[PDB]
């Protein structure tokens, strides 16, 4: 009934609110995508384009919520780049053990950080794992978490090591399914990391629109922005 271009006009305000709160680079990407939806000849184009807005915007608010840097996909570091710059003395071995699984070197998580020392820096990795584990324990939110560990080694108090934090996030209906497949994907490289004596933590989580607005991995004020924009776009897309 409603043409799609007309559908975008109606939600001009909610989408304006959305672009204004997103980080700068995330905002512009969502603004290009929005015009692709307005100028969409087919309802499959519009849908696929709206799927990208749902994920990209959500990531922008995940960055804001956690005070991490939003990284456009084009500029996201892979694992190989992380090992090379952060652990340069192990990269050659990191290349040898990936001879049979070369896709590992090209794994690109949503966030690839390291403890303060294009890998982003964070002051404490253990605190990020705790905050994830806390909310999982408190609101029943499904996560998966893994830590590399050479042999059965103990943590130590007389020296500091470099370490990575690998985080995957998502906005999609099958929350359980997302974290299981994410952790299955990274399990191989965790084991590789144990064998190279590199400390990594892998975290994965997801939200969906049925998640109570106080319980998401993003601030509730951002939950409201997504529900009032990207979620009404999807509902109006199907009906008309």
């Amino acid at each position, epitope marked *: 009934k409603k043409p799609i271009a007309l559908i975008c006009a109606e939600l001009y305000k909610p989408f304006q609110d959305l672009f204004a709160a997103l980080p700068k680079d995330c905002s512009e990407e969502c603004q290009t995508l929005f015009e692709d939806i307005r100028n969409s000849e087919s309802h499959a184009s519009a849908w696929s384009s709206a799927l990208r807005i749902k994920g990209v915007a959500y990531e922008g608010f995940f960055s804001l919520t956690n005070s991490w840097r939003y990284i456009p996909e084009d500029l996201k570091p892979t694992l190989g780049m992380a090992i090379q710059t952060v652990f340069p003395d192990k990269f050659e071995k990191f290349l040898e053990r990936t001879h049979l699984h070369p896709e590992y070197r090209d794994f690109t998580p949503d966030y690839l950080m390291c403890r303060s020392r294009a890998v982003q820096e964070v002051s404490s990795v253990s605190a990020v794992v705790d905050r994830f584990k806390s909310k999982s324990s408190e609101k029943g939110r499904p996560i998966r978490q893994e830590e590399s560990r*050479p042999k059965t080694e103990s943590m130590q*108090e*007389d020296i500091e090591v470099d370490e990575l934090l690998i985080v995957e996030v998502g906005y999609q209906t099958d929350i359980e399914g997302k974290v299981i497949s994410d952790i299955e994907k990274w399990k191989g490289v965790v084991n590789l990391m144990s064998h190279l*004596g590199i400390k990594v933590n892998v975290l994965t989580c997801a939200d969906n629109s049925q998640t109570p607005r106080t319980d998401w991995w993003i601030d509730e004020k951002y939950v409201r922005l997504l529900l009032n924009s990207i979620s009404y776009l999807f509902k109006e897309l199907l009906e008309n």
Partner: antibody
Amino acid sequence: EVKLEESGGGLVRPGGSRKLSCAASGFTFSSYGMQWVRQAPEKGLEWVAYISSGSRTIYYADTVKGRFTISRDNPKNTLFLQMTSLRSEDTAMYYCATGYGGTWFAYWGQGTLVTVSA
Amino acid sequence: QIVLSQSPLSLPVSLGDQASISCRSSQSLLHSNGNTYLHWYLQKPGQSPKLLIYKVSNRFSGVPDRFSGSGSGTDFTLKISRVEAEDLGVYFCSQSTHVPYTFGGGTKLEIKR
């Protein structure tokens, strides 16, 4: 001077429970991991449990897992060991210890004796 | 578990003589951070244990310099260069590279007479 001072020992029936405490002084307790070690009479030393400075990392000897809980209270410079489901094989001198900079046992208390028997 | 094997079980030694105690590990104690967490303790009769040497060869502050440690990987040695009467007691090695932390079974230093 660094000093560690255990208390809470005594006699426990098998299956019983008992909490030990270790009061620490002479160093900034909250910055260091703390440990429990025990020694059955006329036997060698046996590591029990470790707890990191901020309690985030805890390790247990396999023979106490699921029965013993280690914890600390940093504002009160006190280390705890909660023992439950005690067995006569848990009879031992219990020592708290710290590396004061590492995971080795640099500083030791005088120990407290726990006897598990009916 | 890491198994630590001390030899000899007992060591009779004359005052003034050197003593050597061996601790072997069932796997390497080199930690991935580059350190090697093998340590030596002395327990005098009726006392709690005291640290002598931490990470293979670092003498603990205040320990007499007759005590030294050496080795690497799975093979480590405590040496007493010149035994004194107060050195009577049980010597233990222990490792904290892997969990569980484990002790050797002890060497009893006996004074010859």
